[PDB]
Design a binder for this molecule. Structure first.
Ligand SMILES: [Zn+2]
Ligand SMILES: [Zn+2]
Ligand SMILES: [Zn+2]
Ligand SMILES: [Zn+2]
Lengths: 119, 25
């Protein structure tokens, strides 16, 4: 997205916010690189974030935002419906249901792929 | 689908913030 290539990235904190380990040690006492929120800089092991290997690869190439920082990729807002924002299971971008193309009135069932990822 | 709300729950809680600051120092 043109607006992801444009917001600067915060200084990463080299500690997992969930388990307090570093890149040297996750919850299984194995090394694992962190991913860091572009807006707040806080970090997590992909395994602590419960991300699949495939999702992990994709988010490391994007201006990834944590759960609380996530803004809608269409309207750039969080807003009153923030908590019901959908997260793409391919790239982890957020979309309000009403901001999807086409707009949705009910929550999708199962794994959900966003308008950017779907072919 | 995952939402912000359901992802918050399914991920599990963050560690106590005082413990994170203690490790950051
Ligand atoms: Zn961790
Ligand atoms: Zn964040
Ligand atoms: Zn939106
Ligand atoms: Zn996507």
């Amino acid at each position: 997205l043109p607006h992801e290539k444009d917001k600067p990235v915060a200084e990463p904190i080299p500690i997992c916010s969930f388990c307090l380990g570093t890149k040297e040690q996750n919850r299984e006492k194995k090394p694992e690189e962190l991913i860091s929120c572009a807006d707040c800089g806080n970090s997590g092991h992909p395994s602590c974030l419960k991300f699949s290997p495939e999702l992990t690869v994709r988010v490391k190439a994007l201006r990834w935002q944590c759960i609380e920082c996530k803004t809608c990729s269409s309207c750039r807002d969080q807003g009153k419906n923030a908590d019901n924002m959908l997260f793409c299971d391919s790239c982890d971008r957020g979309f309000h249901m009403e901001c999807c193309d086409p707009p949705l009135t009910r929550m999708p069932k199962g794994m959900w792929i966003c308008q950017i990822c779907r072919p | 689908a995952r939402t912000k709300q359901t992802a918050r729950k399914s991920t599990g809680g963050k560690a106590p913030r005082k413990q994170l600051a203690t490790k950051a120092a």
